[PDB]
Amino acid sequence: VLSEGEWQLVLHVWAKVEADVAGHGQDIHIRLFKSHPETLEKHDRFKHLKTEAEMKASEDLKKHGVTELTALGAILKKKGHHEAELKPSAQSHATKHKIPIKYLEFISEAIIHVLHSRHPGDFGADAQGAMNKALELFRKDIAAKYKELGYQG
Numbered sequence: 821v822l823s824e825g826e827w828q829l830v831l832h833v834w835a836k837v838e839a840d841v842a843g844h845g846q847d848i849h850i851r852l853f854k855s856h857p858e859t860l861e862k863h864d865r866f867k868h869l870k871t872e873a874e875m876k877a878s879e880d881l882k883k884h885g886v887t888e889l890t891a892l893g894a895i896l897k898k899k900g901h902h903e904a905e906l907k908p909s910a911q912s913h914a915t916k917h918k919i920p921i922k923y924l925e926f927i928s929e930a931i932i933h934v935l936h937s938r939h940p941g942d943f944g945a946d947a948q949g950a951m952n953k954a955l956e957l958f959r960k961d962i963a964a965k966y967k968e969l970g971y972q973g
């Protein structure tokens with residue numbers, strides 16, 4: 821469980837993300853695919869994008885990042901009371917996309933990296949620790965749902 825002050829730090833920097841969801845999402849994916857190229861293989865269409873400029877030019881990939889970050893933002897804003905918001909993504913990622921927990925760690929690391937690169941003044945040690953706690957909680961609850969649905973990845 822996060823403190824009220826930790827949630828405020830999470831939501832303060834998430835308001836900064838919302839000034840450019842699309843660009844944050846692009847940077848997160850580029851970082852994710854570069855640091856962990858195996859994650860690109862889960863995207864049938866995007867895995868054929870060969871350079872960083874091709875990635876930024878893909879409207880499909882840009883729209884996908886907004887879709888992902890909008891769902892994450894809606895989970896974060898429930899400050900842990902997020903079962904109704906989290907369950908549908910747990911379902912699709914367990915039964916259709918098959919995204920292992922390790923890959924959710926990889927993208928959490930990319931989120932942390934991008935937030936620090938774009939928002940250092942709003943992402944000091946305390947802020948980073950709170951965002952890390954919130955993404956850990958997301959992954960913990962995603963993992964429990966994965967199991968309930970029979971997905972051990």
Ligand code: HEM
Pocket residue numbers: 859860862863884887888889891892908909912913917919923924927
């Ligand atoms: C913060 C973590 C993530 C969130 C919040 C998130 C959320 C979403 C949402 C809302 C969708 C669209 C609806 C759905 O199909 O469920 C989606 C689709 C998808 N996600 Fe995720 N996702 C995350 C991480 C990942 C990761 C790490 C991968 C792969 C490495 C991945 C692969 C996909 C794929 C393949 C789709 C289907 C896209 C399509 O065919 O258009 N997701 N995700």
